[PDB]
Every structure is written in structure tokens, then in C-alpha cells.
């Protein structure tokens, strides 16, 4: 019961910092939809594909 | 142009602007927009990059267009006057620099918005403005000079 | 006259008419009446006749007078033209008959309301109205053509 608490806390903390990294991927680029997008930051580091 | 202000108990303390595809609102003010179509939108908070949500449909969208690349240090228009500066913001005289002027857009000669002010009350003989802009390749950055109070 | 609109998300999608004693608002539309004296009225559901409670205060009772039977085919006015038929309404031409219009009174030459428009967007060469009507001895009916999409 102590071992499943470590595997639950560290799971929801690592994906919490990953969700912050996912969120900060976009707000440089959702603010200017006319700007072009590199192919490295589209699918490798972040999730958003090319749209519009 | 279209730039609706922000109300709080009658007095004017903030301004909200509409760009192509989105709406903006500064975080240094609290209040409700008097427009009913602009009040039911889920405005989500963000960092200093100032991400908001333009959930309004197309039929009133794109009152003005955001500025492209190739920014000179030439003439730029302003609600109280004019500014001629690209790296920093111009040393405008007094009068402008009061309270509640946050969110007023800075436009070019061709009616295209360049920067949105957020601070810089009074910095002596030369007054600077803390604005957001796109630095070199369209990435939206925030510029703040030294000692910039929230204005 | 008096016909206050109903606004959902700022835009206008329908109109609520006030007949003598009772305010009639269609329920196929949704929203809130902008009047503070009418938004406090309770909403009572019905069939597609679309009743609402006549809690109108005594200061401003009897806004409009309804019209009973003995109705000639005649010529009857309309907000975007005229309708000249008794059993149904006139097949009005295209253009008139858009969206966000259902709820208009149809009045006589004396100003007596005889119908309330609900449906009938497109009916071939000319669009045919789907209104509520009072029958040969003063009972409210609903008259629809075949395949009439509502507003």
C-alpha cells in the first residue's frame, strides 16, 4: 500500500509537468496562427498538427 | 475600429480588443465586458504570453488584422497620438500614462495592429510602454522595460 | 405596437408577442426576453401552441386585441409585406421568410392580430406560412403545410 502510493503520486506529477510542457508548446504559436510551424515542434516534442 | 472596454461598477478600467480569429483581454484588470456576445465566451487564463479564446463565430470576426513581418522603426498610430519605435516603445509625452488604458491596441499606417499595451505609467521625461509583440518569426513575446508598473 | 425580442448568446433568434391578457412566446426558440418586466414572468409549457403565463401587471394590460372568426380572405398586413388568404396564409415570395422571425403578429386593417407565424421556411415557388389560428368558433388550432421545417 506504500508502494502503490509512490507509483500513483509520481505518475500524476510527471504527467502534470508534461501537461505544462504540452500547454507551453502551443501558446507561442496559437497567438499567431499566420506564422509558419517547424516540423520538429509539430509532432515530436508536441502534439498539434498543421491546421487551417 | 472595434475595441470594447471593460466595466467594473460603472467606471472604465480596462479595454478588450478583437483580432483576426481571436479576442484579447489583459490580466491586470477585473470586470465584465458590457457586450453580451463577448461575455459568454470562455476566456481562459494564461501566462505573460496572454492566450485568450476567440470562441465567437465568423460573422463579426476579424475587425482588424495582426501585423506581419518586416517591422521598420517608422510611423505607428495610437489612440492618443503616435509612436515610432520597434525595439522599444516611444517616449510619448504626458496625458497618456494614466490609469485604465491597458489593452488599447497600437496600429500601423495600414490599420493593422502591432502591439497591445499593458504597463509603463510614467518613467520620467521619457515614458516607456510594456507591450506584447512578435519578435522575429511570429513567436509572440512580451517586452517589459525596467520599473514598469501595471497600467 | 409592442413585441419584445428574445435573445440567446446576444443575437436575436425569435420574437415574443403580447396579446390581451397573455404573452405568447414560441418554445421552439430558446433564450431570454430582454425586458425586466417580462423575464420575471413564469414560463408554462404547452403543446406547439406555445403558451406562456399571463402574469402581465395591471399598469400595462391589454397590449393588443385578438381577432375572432368571420374572417374574410381579404388583405392582411405583415411585417415584411402582406398576406391575402384566410384558410392558410398567402404564399409569400422568396427572400421574406428567413430565420429568426417566428413570433410576428399578423394584423388586420384595424390592427387585430389573427395569427402567429411559426414555420414554413420554403414551400416550392413561394413559401407558405405555418401559423396558429382561431377556428370557426374561437378555439386555437395549429395549421401546418406538409414538410414545413420550423424556424
From Swiss-Prot, chain A:
<feature type="transmembrane region" description="Helical">
    <location>
        <begin position="1"/>
        <end position="17"/>
    </location>
</feature>
<feature type="region of interest" description="Transient transmembrane before p62-6K protein processing">
    <location>
        <begin position="25"/>
        <end position="45"/>
    </location>
</feature>
<comment type="subunit">
    <text>Processing of the precursor of protein E3/E2 into E2 and E3 results in a heterodimer of the spike glycoproteins E2 and E1. Spike at virion surface are constituted of three E2-E1 heterodimers. Interacts with 6K protein.</text>
</comment>
<feature type="lipid moiety-binding region" description="S-palmitoyl cysteine; by host">
    <location>
        <position position="46"/>
    </location>
</feature>
<feature type="lipid moiety-binding region" description="S-palmitoyl cysteine; by host">
    <location>
        <position position="25"/>
    </location>
</feature>
<protein>
    <recommendedName>
        <fullName>Spike glycoprotein E2</fullName>
    </recommendedName>
</protein>
<feature type="topological domain" description="Cytoplasmic">
    <location>
        <begin position="18"/>
        <end position="52"/>
    </location>
</feature>
<comment type="function">
    <text>Plays a role in viral attachment to target host cell, by binding to the cell receptor. Synthesized as a p62 precursor which is processed by furin at the cell membrane just before virion budding, giving rise to E2-E1 heterodimer. The p62-E1 heterodimer is stable, whereas E2-E1 is unstable and dissociate at low pH. p62 is processed at the last step, presumably to avoid E1 fusion activation before its final export to cell surface.</text>
</comment>
<feature type="lipid moiety-binding region" description="S-palmitoyl cysteine; by host">
    <location>
        <position position="45"/>
    </location>
</feature>
UniProtKB/Swiss-Prot annotation, chains B, C:
<feature type="site" description="Involved in dimerization of the capsid protein">
    <location>
        <position position="109"/>
    </location>
</feature>
<feature type="modified residue" description="Phosphothreonine">
    <location>
        <position position="3"/>
    </location>
</feature>
<feature type="site" description="Involved in dimerization of the capsid protein">
    <location>
        <position position="76"/>
    </location>
</feature>
<feature type="domain" description="Peptidase S3">
    <location>
        <begin position="2"/>
        <end position="151"/>
    </location>
</feature>
<comment type="subunit">
    <text>Part of a tetrameric complex composed of host CRM1, host importin alpha/beta dimer and the viral capsid; this complex blocks the receptor-mediated transport through the nuclear pore. Interacts with host phosphatase PPP1CA; this interaction dephosphorylates the capsid protein, which increases its ability to bind to the viral genome. Interacts with host karyopherin KPNA4; this interaction allows the nuclear import of the viral capsid protein. Interacts with spike glycoprotein E2. Interacts with host IRAK1; the interaction leads to inhibition of IRAK1-dependent signaling.</text>
</comment>
<feature type="active site" description="Charge relay system">
    <location>
        <position position="102"/>
    </location>
</feature>
<comment type="function">
    <text>Forms an icosahedral capsid with a T=4 symmetry composed of 240 copies of the capsid protein surrounded by a lipid membrane through which penetrate 80 spikes composed of trimers of E1-E2 heterodimers. The capsid protein binds to the viral RNA genome at a site adjacent to a ribosome binding site for viral genome translation following genome release. Possesses a protease activity that results in its autocatalytic cleavage from the nascent structural protein.</text>
</comment>
<feature type="active site" description="Charge relay system">
    <location>
        <position position="28"/>
    </location>
</feature>
<protein>
    <recommendedName>
        <fullName>Capsid protein</fullName>
    </recommendedName>
</protein>
<feature type="active site" description="Charge relay system">
    <location>
        <position position="50"/>
    </location>
</feature>
Amino acid at each position: 500500500c506504500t508502494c502503490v502510493a509512490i507509483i500513483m503520486v509520481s505518475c500524476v506529477t510527471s504527467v502534470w509537468l508534461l501537461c505544462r510542457t504540452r500547454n507551453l508548446c502551443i501558446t507561442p504559436y496559437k497567438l499567431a496562427p499566420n506564422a509558419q510551424v517547424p516540423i520538429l515542434l509539430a509532432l515530436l516534442c508536441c502534439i498539434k498538427p498543421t491546421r487551417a | 475600429d472595434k475595441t470594447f472596454p471593460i466595466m467594473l461598477n460603472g467606471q472604465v478600467n480596462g479595454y478588450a480588443c478583437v483580432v483576426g480569429g481571436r479576442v484579447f483581454k489583459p490580466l491586470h484588470v477585473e470586470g465584465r465586458i458590457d457586450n453580451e456576445q463577448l461575455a459568454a465566451i470562455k476566456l481562459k487564463k494564461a501566462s505573460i504570453y496572454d492566450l485568450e479564446y476567440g470562441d465567437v463565430p465568423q460573422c463579426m470576426k476579424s475587425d482588424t488584422l495582426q501585423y506581419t513581418s518586416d517591422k521598420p522603426p517608422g510611423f505607428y498610430n495610437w489612440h492618443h497620438g503616435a509612436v515610432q519605435y520597434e525595439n522599444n516603445r516611444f517616449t510619448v509625452p504626458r496625458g497618456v500614462g494614466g490609469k485604465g488604458d491597458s489593452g488599447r491596441p497600437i496600429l500601423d499606417n495600414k490599420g493593422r495592429v502591432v502591439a497591445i499595451v499593458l504597463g509603463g505609467v510614467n518613467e520620467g521625461s521619457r515614458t516607456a510602454l510594456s507591450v506584447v509583440t512578435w519578435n522575429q518569426k511570429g513567436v509572440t513575446v512580451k517586452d517589459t522595460p525596467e520599473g514598469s508598473e501595471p497600467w
